[PDB]
Design an enzyme around this catalytic site. Structure first.
Site, PDB file in Angstrom:
ATOM      1  N   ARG A 239      59.389  44.282  33.337  1.00  0.00           N
ATOM      2  CA  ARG A 239      58.143  44.375  33.616  1.00  0.00           C
ATOM      3  C   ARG A 239      57.407  42.609  33.203  1.00  0.00           C
ATOM      4  O   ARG A 239      56.705  42.422  33.764  1.00  0.00           O
ATOM      5  CB  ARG A 239      57.273  45.376  32.640  1.00  0.00           C
ATOM      6  CG  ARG A 239      55.763  45.443  32.771  1.00  0.00           C
ATOM      7  CD  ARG A 239      55.364  46.296  31.835  1.00  0.00           C
ATOM      8  NE  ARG A 239      55.751  47.675  32.053  1.00  0.00           N
ATOM      9  CZ  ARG A 239      55.691  48.783  31.307  1.00  0.00           C
ATOM     10  NH1 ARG A 239      55.000  48.699  30.024  1.00  0.00           N
ATOM     11  NH2 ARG A 239      56.025  50.262  31.554  1.00  0.00           N
ATOM     12  N   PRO A 312      48.082  45.706  19.396  1.00  0.00           N
ATOM     13  CA  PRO A 312      46.600  44.947  19.878  1.00  0.00           C
ATOM     14  C   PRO A 312      46.025  46.043  20.747  1.00  0.00           C
ATOM     15  O   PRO A 312      46.589  46.244  22.000  1.00  0.00           O
ATOM     16  CB  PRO A 312      47.142  43.748  20.617  1.00  0.00           C
ATOM     17  CG  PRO A 312      48.205  43.204  20.106  1.00  0.00           C
ATOM     18  CD  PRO A 312      49.114  44.717  19.969  1.00  0.00           C
ATOM     19  N   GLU A 341      42.079  41.032  24.081  1.00  0.00           N
ATOM     20  CA  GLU A 341      41.694  42.310  23.495  1.00  0.00           C
ATOM     21  C   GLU A 341      40.380  42.316  23.263  1.00  0.00           C
ATOM     22  O   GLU A 341      39.726  43.309  23.145  1.00  0.00           O
ATOM     23  CB  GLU A 341      42.805  42.614  22.484  1.00  0.00           C
ATOM     24  CG  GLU A 341      42.865  43.786  22.005  1.00  0.00           C
ATOM     25  CD  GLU A 341      43.515  44.656  23.210  1.00  0.00           C
ATOM     26  OE1 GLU A 341      44.563  44.189  23.832  1.00  0.00           O
ATOM     27  OE2 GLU A 341      42.895  45.749  23.653  1.00  0.00           O
ATOM     28  N   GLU A 368      41.147  46.709  31.341  1.00  0.00           N
ATOM     29  CA  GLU A 368      41.935  45.856  31.066  1.00  0.00           C
ATOM     30  C   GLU A 368      42.142  44.635  31.937  1.00  0.00           C
ATOM     31  O   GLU A 368      42.685  43.566  31.665  1.00  0.00           O
ATOM     32  CB  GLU A 368      43.543  46.385  31.127  1.00  0.00           C
ATOM     33  CG  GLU A 368      43.830  47.143  32.159  1.00  0.00           C
ATOM     34  CD  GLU A 368      44.975  48.119  32.220  1.00  0.00           C
ATOM     35  OE1 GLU A 368      45.603  48.052  30.784  1.00  0.00           O
ATOM     36  OE2 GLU A 368      45.904  48.424  33.113  1.00  0.00           O
ATOM     37  N   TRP A 443      65.953  56.369  43.615  1.00  0.00           N
ATOM     38  CA  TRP A 443      65.266  55.557  42.666  1.00  0.00           C
ATOM     39  C   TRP A 443      65.814  54.265  42.897  1.00  0.00           C
ATOM     40  O   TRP A 443      65.201  53.226  42.907  1.00  0.00           O
ATOM     41  CB  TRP A 443      65.400  55.985  41.212  1.00  0.00           C
ATOM     42  CG  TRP A 443      64.630  55.289  40.412  1.00  0.00           C
ATOM     43  CD1 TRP A 443      63.067  55.541  40.272  1.00  0.00           C
ATOM     44  CD2 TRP A 443      64.794  54.447  39.146  1.00  0.00           C
ATOM     45  NE1 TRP A 443      62.587  54.635  39.327  1.00  0.00           N
ATOM     46  CE2 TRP A 443      63.606  53.894  38.574  1.00  0.00           C
ATOM     47  CE3 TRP A 443      66.089  53.798  38.933  1.00  0.00           C
ATOM     48  CZ2 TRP A 443      63.674  52.988  37.676  1.00  0.00           C
ATOM     49  CZ3 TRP A 443      66.297  52.944  37.923  1.00  0.00           C
ATOM     50  CH2 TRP A 443      65.077  52.325  37.470  1.00  0.00           C
ATOM     51  N   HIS A 471      54.891  54.424  29.151  1.00  0.00           N
ATOM     52  CA  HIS A 471      54.044  55.164  29.826  1.00  0.00           C
ATOM     53  C   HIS A 471      54.646  56.324  30.558  1.00  0.00           C
ATOM     54  O   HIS A 471      53.592  57.127  30.752  1.00  0.00           O
ATOM     55  CB  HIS A 471      53.015  54.246  30.852  1.00  0.00           C
ATOM     56  CG  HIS A 471      52.636  52.729  30.185  1.00  0.00           C
ATOM     57  ND1 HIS A 471      52.153  52.877  28.812  1.00  0.00           N
ATOM     58  CD2 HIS A 471      52.623  51.672  30.796  1.00  0.00           C
ATOM     59  CE1 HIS A 471      51.900  51.598  28.616  1.00  0.00           C
ATOM     60  NE2 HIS A 471      52.043  50.952  29.779  1.00  0.00           N
TER      61      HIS A 471
END
Lengths: 581, 242
Positions: A239, A312, A341, A368, A443, A471
């Site tokens: 990521r 955060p 933030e 966000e 996958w 997540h």
């Protein structure tokens, strides 16, 4: 009545994150069951709503979030079962113990252990056990746990008048009731497929640029033609590509742009971090600082006698109360997330007069994406020279802007085919398009064609590879990250179009200009009372999701990535494999 | 400076009539947080008097301080109270962090967010009625499509300014056809003797020489006249000397 019962629950979570005691774990529970009782004593009284006769659009947008019955449509044993497996799948991710199979006499833990081994390790075999044993010791029992979970949420979606559970994450993007601005639930599938076709030459030049610089570190491990091994992406999954910047630095003789050496000698504290960065917001045209943000928030870790989780997040507590919580450190990256933030907390400052069902973002990714436009405009050389943190005469050439562009290429552009690879997989496991023997074989077959990453060890159906994230193991939405970048580049283009700056978008600056303040503040104050397809036309002028400012942001980079990869191979193939020996 | 305040829909009445108001220790000292109003200035109230003055004591949230305006509508200005277009008086707010709140939110005092119709100014509306905007009723209970607007506050001193407890004293000025009774403070100067000087008294204007007087005088009189119908004695406005 939702401004008191949720407010007693969410302040107990703020009290738990500040003070971790044994009396504070149960403080979240006894004030938290009354909100869950109010979430079901209102939703059962909201099931017989006649939506065929109400003409008010401000009322009907509130009743769409109240007509959802939730997870208690089914029977009593299945409602016990969803409460059982959800805390089980998050405890084994938090308290997961992983170590080497060769010497199991030492085994450390999650957060100090796995984080350091993806930063500065160069070894091939030692870093391979850090990626494989996390998928072979924690993710083995997820396959009995996710197979009954994937049949649980499909029965929750059919009774609430949806197609499957893939439309549940796309239900927040659904806009209905306004003629001309209609948006179906299945319109997000072809919009993601159309926005990916412009970034497909953008990622393929980023795919060839990483592998060409990594030839010197790994001569006999990385092919000039094939795909990437999965245990060398600089992260646990891929990521954030920010840890691969030391191996993919374009010019090491050029100095990096940072104020870490310039913050120590002036004796700055955490109080001077949020005070100078609040002057960015008042110069744009946003309202001033609140006094409860200053004398009540936790910026300094309160000693070593008590533990406190300081990850955060901006705590939108309620009724106009605004609080932040992080451990502020003296570095470059902590100043940018201080800008990020509080960009969420100034979005929540605008809709203070709106009610509880309208006190949210326009989708699950609106809160966000509106926070990162000040964080992108804080690391520019126009802002850092105006505050006096950098040199008064710092050299800025064509070669030092590539090093700033690769700081925004690795952590923003690199997750976007990884966001597409997971969310296409999560949409099709709940629709029943693949069976159990093709559950995990699909996958890595779709991983090898769209991100260019091949697993070095073949995984069977007894392992669960994508549920090692934060997540997926907490059942959260992942489509918020794909439109996190597309909204933060459409906002950062259109805000400083009115600030009359001629140049590239990475050198643009929205401070010292009040023209971008009034163009933003009428969009920030709407909330959920206006949908996102009409709020986008007030700022960028386009109701559709387009990839036009993303191509103009890296236009000095896409020239240079073309010229450096004249000899290299553009693209990948589905033939090379590390275990094919 | 009240210890106990009233609710925002339960406005009490404290009369300010037949007295002298001293704003030199309240407005000139200014212990409150903000000092702003429209219509009249605070420097105009020292030489301006009215017939009947009214005031109250109530604590709102900090985001509801913008609704207190003449001609304003909103969540509080159209449902709790209303300020008229001919509002003469001023509005003074001050934060009341630790003394007006309690732990886990100040749940003692309530506020109404929804009313069945628009209210008049000076309405002490403490009813428990239900606002209706649908088709079917609910037989008078907080149930199906029936709003319950009565809900308590959440004041605590560790919170932000959006619902910080702000003690707001709306002092309403009003002039009528009756003569004025409540007038503001006014400073005085020293007195000189044995000189032909100008006189600006409370009820006498002129000029002359002030000397000592050995004549009889009353405690209620302002000035005296001689046989030739001119002023020859004046009583001190601050004290009593003819």
């Amino acid at each position: 009545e939702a401004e008191d019962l949720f407010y007693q629950s969410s302040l107990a979570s703020w009290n738990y994150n500040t003070n971790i005691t044994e009396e504070n774990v149960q403080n979240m529970n006894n004030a938290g069951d009354k909100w869950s009782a109010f979430l079901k004593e209102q939703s059962t009284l909201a099931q017989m709503y006649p939506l065929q006769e109400i003409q008010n659009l401000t009322v009907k947008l509130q009743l769409q979030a109240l007509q959802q019955n939730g997870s208690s449509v089914l029977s009593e044993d299945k409602s016990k079962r969803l409460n059982t497996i959800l805390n089980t799948m998050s405890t084994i991710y938090s308290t997961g113990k992983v170590c080497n199979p060769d010497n199991p006499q030492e085994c450390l833990l999650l957060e100090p252990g796995l984080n350091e081994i993806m930063a500065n390790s160069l070894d091939y075999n030692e870093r391979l056990w850090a990626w494989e044993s996390w998928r072979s010791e924690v993710g083995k029992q997820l396959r009995p746990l996710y197979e009954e979970y994937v049949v649980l949420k499909n029965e929750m979606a059919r009774a609430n008048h949806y197609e499957d559970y893939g439309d549940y994450w796309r239900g927040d993007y659904e806009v209905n009731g306004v003629d001309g601005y209609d948006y179906s639930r299945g319109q997000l599938i072809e919009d993601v497929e159309h926005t990916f076709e412009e970034i497909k030459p953008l990622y393929e030049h980023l795919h060839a640029y990483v592998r060409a610089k990594l030839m010197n570190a790994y001569p006999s491990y990385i092919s000039p033609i094939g795909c990437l091994p999965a245990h060398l992406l600089g992260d646990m999954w891929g990521r954030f590509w920010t840890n691969l910047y030391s191996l993919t630095v374009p010019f090491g003789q050029k100095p990096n742009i940072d104020v870490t050496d310039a913050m120590v000698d002036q004796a700055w504290d955490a109080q001077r971090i949020f005070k100078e960065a609040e002057k960015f917001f008042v110069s744009v045209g946003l309202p001033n600082m609140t006094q409860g943000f200053w004398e009540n928030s936790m910026l300094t870790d309160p000693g070593n006698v008590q533990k406190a989780v300081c990850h955060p997040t901006a705590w939108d507590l309620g009724k106009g109360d605004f609080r932040i919580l992080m451990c502020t450190k003296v570095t470059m990256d902590d100043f940018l997330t201080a800008h990020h933030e509080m960009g969420h907390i100034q979005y929540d400052m605008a809709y203070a007069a709106q009610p509880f069902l309208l006190r949210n973002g326009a989708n699950e990714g609106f809160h966000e994406a509106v926070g990162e436009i000040m964080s992108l405009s804080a690391a520019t050389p126009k802002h850092l020279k105006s505050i006096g943190l950098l040199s008064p005469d710092f050299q800025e050439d064509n070669e030092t802007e590539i090093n700033f562009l690769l700081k925004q290429a690795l952590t923003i552009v690199g997750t976007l085919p990884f966001t597409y690879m997971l969310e296409k997989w999560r949409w099709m496991v709940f629709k029943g398009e693949i069976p159990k023997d093709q559950w995990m074989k699909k996958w890595w077959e779709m991983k090898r064609e769209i991100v260019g990453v091949v697993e070095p060890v073949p995984h069977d159906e007894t392992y669960c590879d994508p549920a090692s994230l934060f997540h997926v193991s907490n059942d959260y939405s992942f489509i918020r990250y794909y439109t996190r970048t597309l909204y933060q580049f459409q906002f950062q283009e259109a805000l400083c179009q009115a600030a009359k700056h001629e140049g590239p978008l990475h050198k643009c600056d929205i401070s010292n200009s009040t023209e971008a303040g009034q163009k933003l503040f009428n969009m920030l104050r709407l909330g959920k009372s206006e949908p996102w397809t009409l709020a986008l036309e007030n700022v960028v002028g386009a109701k559709n999701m387009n990839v036009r400012p993303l191509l103009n942001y890296f236009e000095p980079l896409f020239t240079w990535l073309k010229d450096q990869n004249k000899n290299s191979f553009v693209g990948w193939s589905t033939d090379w494999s590390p275990y094919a020996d | 400076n009240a210890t106990r305040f009233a609710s925002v829909y339960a406005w009490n009445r404290k009369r300010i009539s037949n007295c002298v108001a001293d704003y030199s220790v309240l407005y000139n000292l200014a212990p409150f947080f903000t000092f702003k109003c429209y219509g009249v200035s605070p420097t105009k109230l020292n030489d301006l008097c009215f017939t009947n003055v009214y005031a109250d004591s109530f604590v709102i949230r900090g985001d509801e301080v913008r609704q207190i305006a003449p001609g304003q509508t909103g969540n509080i200005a159209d449902y709790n109270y209303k300020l008229p277009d001919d509002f003469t008086g001023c509005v003074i707010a001050w934060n009341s962090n630790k003394l007006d709140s309690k732990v886990s939110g100040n749940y003692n005092y309530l506020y109404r967010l929804f009313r069945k119709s628009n209210l008049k100014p000076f309405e002490r509306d403490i009813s428990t009625e239900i606002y209706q905007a649908g088709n079917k009723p609910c037989n008078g209970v907080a149930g199906f499509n029936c709003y319950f607007p009565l809900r308590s506050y959440s004041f605590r001193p560790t919170y932000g300014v959006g619902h910080q407890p702000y003690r707001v004293v709306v002092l309403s000025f009003e002039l009528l056809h009756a003569p004025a009774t409540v007038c503001g403070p006014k400073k005085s100067t020293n007195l000189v003797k044995n000189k032909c000087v100008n006189f600006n008294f409370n009820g006498l204007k002129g000029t002359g020489v002030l000397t000592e007087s050995n004549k009889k005088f009353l405690p209620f009189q302002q000035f005296g006249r001689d046989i030739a119908d001119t002023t020859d004695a004046v009583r001190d406005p601050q004290t009593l000397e003819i």
